[PDB]
Amino acid sequence: DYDKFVGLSFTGAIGGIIAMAITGGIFGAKAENARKEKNALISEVAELESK
Amino acid sequence: TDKVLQAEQLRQKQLTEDIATKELERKEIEKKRDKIIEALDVIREHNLVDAFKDLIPTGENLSELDLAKPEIELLKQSLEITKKLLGQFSEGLKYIDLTDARKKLDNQIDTASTRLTELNRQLEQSEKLIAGVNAVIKIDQEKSAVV
Amino acid sequence: DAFKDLIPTGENLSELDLAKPEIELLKQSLEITKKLLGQFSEGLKYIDL
C-alpha cells in the first residue's frame, strides 16, 4: 500500500502548481510519517521475532 | 461447586462461541477490503511516466495549416491538458477516500483484535477456573477412593 | 524491436514537399518520445516485479 501511496502521491505532485502544492503538502508529509510509523512496526514485529 | 462448574462451563462456552463469532466478523471485514484494494489497483495505471505519456498525446495534432490558428489550435491543447489534469485529480480524490476507508476498516480489525485479546485472556482465566474445578472434583473422587 | 519502433514513427502518410519541414517532424519527435516513455514505465514495472 505504501509503495502505491508514494506512487499516487507523486503523480498528484507532478501535475501542476497547485497539484504539487496540495499533494506534496498532504501526502509528501504523510509518506514520511506513515513510512516511519510503518518501519517502527517493522522493528516491533522484528523484535517479537527476536523475542 | 457443581453449580459453579456448570455455570462457568456454560459461561466459557458462550465466550468461546462469541470469540469465534468475532473471528468470523473480522474475517468478513478482511473480505470487505478486497473491493477497495482491487479498485485502487485498477485505478493505479499511471506512475511518473504516464503523466508525460499524457502530456505528449495532448500535444499531438491531426490537421495543420501553418497560419490563422497560432493559438486557436492551442485552445484545444490547453483544454485537453486541463482535462487530463482534472482526470488525475478526481481519481486521486477517490484514491484518498478509499485509503481512508482502508484506515477505517483497519481500525475495525484492530478494535476487533483487542476484543479478541481481552476475551481470550478472560477465556484463559476461565480455563484456569474450570481446570481447578475439574481437578478438585477428580481429587474428590480420589478422596472417596482413599475413603 | 527498438529499431522496429524507430522506423514506424519514421513512417508517414501525407506529404506535400513544402511548408512542413519541421511541422511534420513535431509528430515524429513526439511519437518517438511516446515510444521511449512507453519503454520506460514498463521497464519500471519490470523493476518492481
Author numbering:
A (entry chain C): 259 to 309
B (entry chain M): 149 to 295
C (entry chain N): 198 to 246
Show sentences the authors wrote.
We have unraveled structures of the soluble components and the pore assembly of the YaxAB cytolysin from Y. enterocolitica. The crystal structures show an atypical fold, comprising a head domain reminiscent of ClyA family toxins and pronounced coiled-coil and foot domains unique to the YaxAB system. Together, our biochemical data support a role for YaxA as the initial membrane-interacting subunit of the toxin, able to bring the lytic effector YaxB to the target cell surface. Therefore, we propose that this class of toxins defines a new structural family of α-PFTs.
Along its largest dimensions, the C10 symmetric complex spans 160 Å perpendicular and 200 Å parallel to the membrane plane. The map accommodates one YaxA–YaxB dimer per radial spoke, in which the head domains form an extended interface, while the coiled-coil stalks remain distinctly apart. Notably, YaxA protomers are not in contact with each other in the pore, but interact instead with two adjacent YaxB subunits in cis and trans (see below). Embedded in the amphipol membrane surrogate, the foot domain helices of YaxA and YaxB protomers form a staggered, 40-meric α-helical annulus with a diameter of 31 Å at its narrowest distance. The largest contact area between pore protomers exists between the head domains of YaxA and YaxB within a spoke (cis), burying an average surface of 1476 Å2 via a close network of polar and hydrophobic residues. Across two spokes (trans), YaxA and YaxB interact through a hydrophobic patch at the juncture between head and stalk domains, burying a surface of 1088 Å2. The putative transmembrane segment of the C10 symmetric YaxAB complex consists of 40 staggered helices, jointly contributed from YaxA and YaxB foot domains. Notably, YaxA foot domain helices α4 and α5 cover only about half of this distance, requiring YaxB helices α4′ and α4″ to traverse the entire theoretical bilayer. Inside the membrane, two adjacent YaxB protomers form a hydrophobic seal via a conserved α4′ (V197, F200, I204) and α4″ (L227, L234) interface.
